[PDB]
Write a protein that binds this ligand. Structure first.
Ligand SMILES: NC(=O)c1ccc[n+]([C@@H]2O[C@H](COP(=O)([O-])OP(=O)(O)OC[C@H]3O[C@@H](n4cnc5c(N)ncnc54)[C@H](OP(=O)(O)O)[C@@H]3O)[C@@H](O)[C@H]2O)c1
Ligand SMILES: Nc1nc(=O)c2c([nH]1)NCC(CNc1ccc(C(=O)N[C@@H](CCC(=O)O)C(=O)O)cc1)=N2
Ligand SMILES: O=c1ccn([C@H]2C[C@H](O)[C@@H](COP(=O)(O)O)O2)c(=O)[nH]1
Ligand SMILES: O=c1ccn([C@H]2C[C@H](O)[C@@H](COP(=O)(O)O)O2)c(=O)[nH]1
Lengths: 543, 530
């Protein structure tokens, strides 16, 4: 049986930012969709203006397809039983919202402007600017008009008094990922009434990241299509797929239509290794599902790609980077700061199984740092002085970027074939290549071995931060970080956790902030790095 | 105004053509039959394609077609197949009549009484049309006989030709007619496949729901047309853009060219020519199905095979290649070139510690190209073969030419930085990372080289080759190549060739040039990238 919002095509469109608590978050803040609920402040927007949100609002509320109207006209008039009634959309708002708009571009261009109010009389306005007395009389006015879709463009009350009356088929919802002072807030959307079916790319505008999501009301030449089917004649269409994983499992992941959030590059790879991976044994003797050769790209000028579908920490991985940059190989330096990334690889037991019987505990051999600052020097022990020994690759790439930015030889390589056996383990992160165009730096990192569940989330972060570091000391803006995965594997003991993760919807990404005073690569310290607006799902223990 | 018959009754042709017992064109593939049977006897994948196409039906779409045909006449679902009598007689008895299809048979010498089978007999093309008028069916496929294909093409009764290119040569006595390019144009090209010891592909000649808004919304910030960079005209890629489906794996290469031309960044370069460049691509080629030698221009493999054998031997002496009339490394070994690299004490054509040396002796002190380096440095090639044999699930099977210490002593640094290998279920894949990529000239050869190398390693390790995966870093088109690449991007690829190795070679160091054969290379003409 047909419903009102379904017939008249009534949608809500809004934008919500984060709201400050006077109660400083003394415990770990808990995030959900309701985190983004701030609508207004003192009769205006909490962030004053956002030029990309404003472009999106206009674009959505004014777009019309005339060739799909008849079906809507036939739907509506037949619903009303009657036979008879430039195509434009209806925008419905409250009195305050209408007063909030500046007169210069009021009324709202190319739209049928309706205004809910009880002190407004039609006398003071016009015919094309409909005034309405109550919620009930909209449906009446929509029966007498030619319009494509009907958008409730807000007022806290208006949204409130439309959602509880179930008059909203979809909510077009912008997540503004920054905090402001707010006096009015969007209602709390009930997970049983609406659900997200799409998530956009992540964007930066007016000094904040944002994304656009779509809530959907829940249910509680032609013959160019055939040529397509012919080209698929050689597939294996079935019920059971390689690795015993079910339909139930990825319900929410598969229920989304559009998944353009860049976090899906990581999640889709996980999905693909789960659906199509090869069962293989491994060195650790745990078992993996693996595939070979993927690429991700992250636009560092729009966001910092810190995964939001679980909680990630960055002190440790920043310290590792600073340790690399110093050329250090001494695992004790990291352990004394309680960064234990390399602890297991520096034990007596581990070093002995590597046949490094004459190596001091936590002396990791000529690994990353040594290779970046001293490639080709003779490694002795972790306490020796190597000043001016070997090739200082880090310095060389920084000089190439500054003086010869179009070079195709700007590479930082860790995979020193001669020294491999002396390393506690060989590098997973083989090399970094750099590319500079128009004042912008991009970096490719080739990773030979990628633990999708535990390692890769951190690996993305390390090299994003490093790309910022290199860019800043060379007076460039960071553009793309490009992650190439060789042997890409999901450990079997991660499978259940990654199943939980794949059915979580990303939040818009945070931003990285470097102390702008730092201008040489060796001058960074742990307090020079700030992550802002990290909104994330709850922590997951992978193992 | 008024419809052609082929449109109203959806009359298509499906056929398969081999090469016939050198300049190549579409007419290269024209072998239809021999001694009343197929020139190749049998091809499983082609048969499967044939069955899939001629039996596939879309129930939802019929009522739209019923109206069309009923308006034109004023008025379980199956397709029709129409064949010549001789072709009917070549079908084995247990496959007559073709299952799940209405079978129609053209004949003058035989009549309904001469057939036991549920089939329509007609003695006139015109009668086929009358019959289609009376029947309920989805589409009508003319499945040939050469005599049948010819007359239907001449009468302009064919809306599309579904054409299989069987990329091998056989004895033939009957032939598909030469298609007129003025009347039919190719609109789609499939992936390339191997079946019954031949490659083949499938091409198509053509006669010359609420969510959809959400998609428009999420595209609200995409650019206009005119802002998308370079001086590139529509007319320049009209054939390239004419194609509906571009699934031939050569499009991985061609699409990258296209992308660099339309979206690339204008940059100066070490050479002074300047390029359009972009950063980070990936191509995948399935070596179990084809050898990915580009077909949209002519390439030779003798040189790059000799180069590869020279690498495997650990050589750094350019004279070895010049004596086999291979001049790939010539320019990088001249007095002048070595002087410009500050290598004043290097003998001419002594390329220094390049690829071969790093593969066999990484870390050894380089002296000159004549020295005996026995058991010095790390023999990486040997190690990766041992790892593949004895520890196939290792994630450390890498071969690296970027020896940071030695870079300055090389005539020039390597472009092919590394190879990583992967082993599953008896099958070997290879990723090669290329730091710098001359799309126009180098990339077609580099694809070939490493595909061959993957074959060689797979073989001496008793594996079958699987994927060559090519990763490009600085991917550039030289400006002096643009006009030649505009030409090539409008050529339609041909089914790829195959590569055969002497199967008696069991150690990587034992291959010689004659142990390599390229078969069935069909290609467009040579292009100077001038
Ligand atoms: N590679 C492929 O794709 C493919 C596809 C199909 C067939 N084939 C091969 O092609 C060969 C057979 O082809 P073909 O040209 O020799 O024979 P065909 O075209 O199958 O048959 C010719 C016969 O069909 C009947 N016919 C054709 N046009 C007619 C008309 N307008 N009116 C009445 N009858 C008509 C006549 O039969 P009567 O003599 O009884 O009058 C005529 O002799 C075989 O080798 C077969 O294997 C290859
Ligand atoms: N593309 C193409 N390939 C062909 O082999 C072919 C064609 N077109 N057009 C006409 C034709 C006529 N010759 C033949 C000979 C035998 C069968 C046959 O036995 N077909 C069965 C087997 C298919 C299967 O089991 O995969 C059929 O049901 O189609 C069909 C056509 N053969
Ligand atoms: O920064 C890191 C370090 C390690 N690994 C993973 C990949 C493999 O699971 C394992 C390294 O061991 P091998 O692949 O070298 O055996 O750790 C990462 O993903 N990222
Ligand atoms: O096998 C090769 C060797 C060279 N090049 C190209 C890429 C660059 O245009 C040039 C070397 O350039 P540099 O990056 O060294 O400047 O040669 C290839 O594409 N493939």
């Amino acid at each position: 049986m047909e419903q009102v919002c379904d017939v008249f095509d009534i949608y809500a469109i809004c934008a919500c930012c984060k709201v400050e608590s006077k109660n400083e978050g003394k415990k770990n803040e808990v995030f959900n969709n309701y985190t983004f609920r701030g609508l207004g402040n003192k009769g205006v927007l909490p962030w004053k203006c956002n030029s990309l949100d404003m472009k999106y609002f206009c674009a959505v509320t004014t777009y019309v397809n005339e060739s799909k109207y008849e079906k809507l006209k036939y739907k509506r008039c037949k619903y009303l039983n009657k036979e008879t009634v430039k195509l434009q959309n209806v925008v419905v708002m409250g009195r305050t919202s209408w007063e909030s708009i500046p007169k210069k571009f009021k009324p709202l261009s190319n739209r049928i402007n309706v205004i809910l109010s009880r002190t407004l009389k039609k006398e003071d306005f016009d015919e094309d600017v409909y005034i309405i007395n109550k919620v009930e009389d909209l449906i009446v006015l929509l029966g007498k008009l030619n319009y494509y879709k009907c958008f409730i463009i807000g007022g806290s009350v208006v949204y409130q008094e439309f959602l509880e009356k179930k008059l909203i088929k979809k909510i077009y919802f912008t997540r503004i990922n920054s905090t402001y002072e707010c006096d009015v807030f969007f209602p709390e959307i009930n997970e049983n009434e609406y659900q997200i079916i799409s998530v956009s790319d992540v964007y930066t505008s007016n000094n904040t990241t944002l994304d656009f999501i779509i809530y959907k009301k829940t249910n509680n030449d032609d013959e160019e299509e055939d040529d397509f089917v012919y080209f698929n004649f050689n597939k294996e269409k079935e019920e059971k797929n390689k690795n015993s994983i079910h339909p139930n499992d990825f319900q929410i992941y598969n229920s989304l239509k559009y998944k353009y959030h860049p976090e899906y590059q990581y999640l889709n790879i996980i999905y693909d290794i789960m659906m199509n991976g090869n069962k293989q044994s491994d060195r650790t003797g745990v078992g993996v599902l693996s595939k070979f050769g993927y690429i991700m790209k992250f636009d560092l000028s729009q966001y910092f790609p810190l995964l939001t579908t679980k909680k990630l920490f960055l002190r440790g991985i920043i310290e590792e980077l600073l340790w690399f940059i110093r050329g250090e190989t001494n695992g004790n330096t990291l352990l004394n700061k309680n960064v234990r990334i390399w602890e297991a690889n520096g034990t007596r037991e581990f070093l002995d199984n590597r046949k490094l019987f004459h190596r001091e505990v936590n002396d990791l051999g000529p690994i990353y740092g040594f290779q970046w600052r001293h490639f080709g020097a003779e490694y002795t022990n972790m306490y020796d002085n190597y000043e001016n020994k070997g090739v200082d690759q880090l310095k060389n790439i920084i000089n190439l970027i500054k003086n010869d930015p179009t070079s195709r030889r700007i590479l930082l390589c860790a995979w020193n074939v001669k020294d491999l056996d002396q390393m506690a383990l060989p590098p997973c992160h083989i090399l970094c290549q750099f590319y500079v165009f128009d004042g912008k730096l991009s970096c490719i990192m080739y990773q030979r071995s990628c633990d999708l569940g535990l390692g890769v989330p951190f690996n993305i972060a390390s090299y994003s931060i490093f790309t910022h570091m290199i860019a800043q000391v060379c007076n460039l803006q960071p553009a793309q970080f490009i992650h190439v995965l060789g042997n890409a594997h999901v450990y079997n003991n991660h499978i259940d956790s990654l199943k939980i993760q794949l059915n979580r919807i990303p939040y818009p990404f945070p931003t990285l902030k470097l102390n702008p005073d730092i201008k040489n690569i060796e001058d960074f310290t742990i307090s020079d790095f700030t992550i802002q607006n990290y909104v994330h799902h709850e922590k997951i223990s992978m193992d």
